Ligand binder design. Structure first.
Ligand SMILES: [Cl-]
Length: 537
């Protein structure tokens, strides 16, 4: 039923809704269009749109775009793509920057009422004074002089960084952030959305409340005072409504083990070439995860399962992989492919045959079948063969027989070597071990996967592992020195031919290897390329 974990915020919203404090709930998700979203942002997405649908309310996708230097439309498009990918349907799509006029008007009002002033001091002097908690000399300029300067700022008469509009609050305030914080700055740069109209742009702390207020947001949810000051001094001006007013509430950042999320670090991994691109399945971007093969349902489940709170415990990657596995288990038909192929010839078998093999294990309700080709030549995993097997060895070796999955039992006859490593197995079927045990009672200790070398399809396999070996690379030192050099292994293996008649977005479990699907970018019917979404436990 209820999508968002019982937590501080549901109970809170429920209270306010029942008691009538707001008619509809109205949340927003506000990313800055200056990058790609990542698994962290999923929490803010699920929470904000989740809230809306649970309570018959509205949720705005809004680009908080007040930083003309970095922000681009493709980042916006990309954001919307990812939001809708997760299954969510913004009530509206909005751009902070379409409210730039209203914001500038709301500034005039501040200057008029003596609540803000232009500051000529250079940045380094402003912060030294702030640290001393003393006032700018320019702090007590008249209304008139300020309006005239701000206007000259608007016209682009001053260059970038040279002048700022600031709130007149308290420079000796115990809270640093309230020491006359900056409302407007100057950037001589064009904005991707609104073009060249503006040369002065509001700061986060001034634009955020106003964008909320303009939208009639009720609950403003951000991760872990100036906000209030902006609302309380402007309620009822510039034809913003006099009430109700939005209220900030705070949840904790998602910090996932074995993964970095800081945009600067991610930038270092792409640019550094440590990763092939922003949708690289090694990355925790939503792009990457999509292309990896994770389903939006698992990310949303992951997000729910982990809860919403002030509780900032680092989430274990095991959990995520665990969720992705559970996600796919009812819906990944089971097929057989081999990743590290060693050939196996059968000396006592001729011709071909096709076996009705089941897609689903006993315990999945689904029925389903495919013709699986058998022949005298197969590939098995090199790793399912030991010349010197350990005590628990359940697979092929010189003494031991082994179950070919869905097919015969076989036992080893000859091993052929070259360069001192192992290049081909000569083996024999134990007849008629098909669908049955061996006459002699000695069953194989184990079952291994395999394909017919006479029928199999080449596949390029991209085995993705976790990006880092250390639990906390994000705060650990040289995070680069913590990369997992196994993050991607590429092997050229083979898969059963059935897969050719599957829609291309099919996700498989390849038995005893993990979950896989055609990489949406590179794979082609005549040159398959499949990513391993996740291994088994
Ligand atoms: Cl079997």
């Amino acid at each position: 039923m209820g999508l968002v974990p019982e937590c501080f915020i549901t109970e809170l919203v429920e209270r306010d809704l029942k008691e009538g404090k707001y008619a509809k709930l109205v949340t927003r998700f506000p990313p800055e269009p200056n990058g790609y979203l990542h698994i962290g942002h999923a929490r803010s997405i699920v929470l904000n749109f989740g809230l809306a649908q649970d309570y018959g309310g509205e949720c705005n996708l809004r680009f908080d775009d007040t930083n003309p230097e970095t922000e681009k439309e493709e980042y916006a498009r990309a954001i919307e793509e990812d939001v809708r990918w997760l299954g969510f349907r913004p009530t509206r799509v909005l751009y902070a920057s379409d409210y730039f006029e209203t914001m500038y008007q709301c500034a005039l009002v501040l200057i008029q009422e003596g609540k803000a002033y232009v500051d000529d001091l250079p940045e380094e002097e402003m912060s030294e004074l702030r640290a001393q908690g003393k006032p700018s000399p320019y702090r007590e300029r008249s209304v008139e002089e300020n309006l005239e300067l701000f206007e000259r700022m608007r016209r682009g008469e001053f260059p970038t960084g040279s002048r700022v509009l600031r709130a007149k609050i308290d420079p000796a305030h115990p809270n640093f952030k309230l020491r006359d914080p900056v409302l407007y700055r100057i950037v001589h740069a064009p904005h991707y959305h609104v073009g060249d109209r503006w040369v002065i742009y509001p700061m986060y702390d001034f634009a955020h409340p106003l964008e909320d207020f303009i939208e009639g947001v009720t609950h403003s949810l951000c991760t872990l005072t100036v906000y209030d000051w902006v609302i309380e001094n402007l309620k009822g001006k510039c034809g913003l409504p006099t009430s109700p007013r939005p209220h900030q509430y705070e949840f904790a950042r998602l910090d996932l083990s074995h993964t970095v999320l800081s945009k600067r670090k991610l930038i270092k991994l792409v640019e550094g070439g440590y990763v092939s691109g922003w949708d690289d399945p090694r990355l925790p971007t939503l792009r990457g995860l999509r292309r990896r093969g994770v389903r939006p349902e698992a990310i949303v489940e992951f997000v729910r399962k982990t809860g919403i709170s002030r509780n900032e415990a680092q989430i274990e990657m095991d959990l995520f992989e665990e969720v992705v596995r559970d996600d796919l288990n009812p819906i990944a038909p089971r097929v057989l492919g081999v990743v590290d192929p060693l050939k196996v010839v059968l000396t006592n078998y001729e011709g071909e045959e096709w076996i009705e093999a089941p897609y689903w294990p006993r315990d999945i309700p689904k029925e389903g079948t495919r013709p699986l080709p058998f022949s005298p030549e197969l590939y098995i995993e090199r790793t399912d063969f030991s010349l010197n097997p350990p005590k628990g060895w359940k697979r092929l070796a010189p003494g031991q027989r082994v179950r070919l999955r869905h097919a015969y039992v076989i036992e080893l006859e000859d091993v052929v070597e070259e360069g001192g490593e192992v290049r081909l197995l000569k083996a024999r079927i134990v007849p008629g071990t098909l669908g049955a045990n061996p006459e002699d009672g000695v069953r194989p200790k184990g079952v291994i996967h395999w394909v017919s070398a006479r029928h199999a399809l080449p596949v390029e396999f991209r085995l993705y592992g976790r990006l880092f070996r250390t639990k906390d690379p994000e705060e650990g030192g040289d995070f680069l020195q913590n990369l997992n050099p196994e993050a991607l292994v590429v092997k050229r293996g083979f898969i059963e031919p059935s897969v050719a008649q599957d829609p291309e977005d099919t996700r498989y479990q390849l038995e005893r290897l993990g979950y896989f699907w055609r990489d949406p970018v590179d794979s082609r019917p005549e040159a398959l390329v499949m990513n391993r979404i996740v291994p088994l436990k």
